[PDB]
């Protein structure tokens, strides 16, 4: 999983 710093733009 590759995540951009928290991503938290979809759920």
Same mark, same amino acid.
Do not use: L
């Given at each position: 999983? =590759?995540? =951009? #710093?928290?991503? #938290?733009?979809?759920?």
């Amino acid at each position: 999983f =590759q995540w =951009q #710093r928290n991503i #938290r733009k979809v759920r």
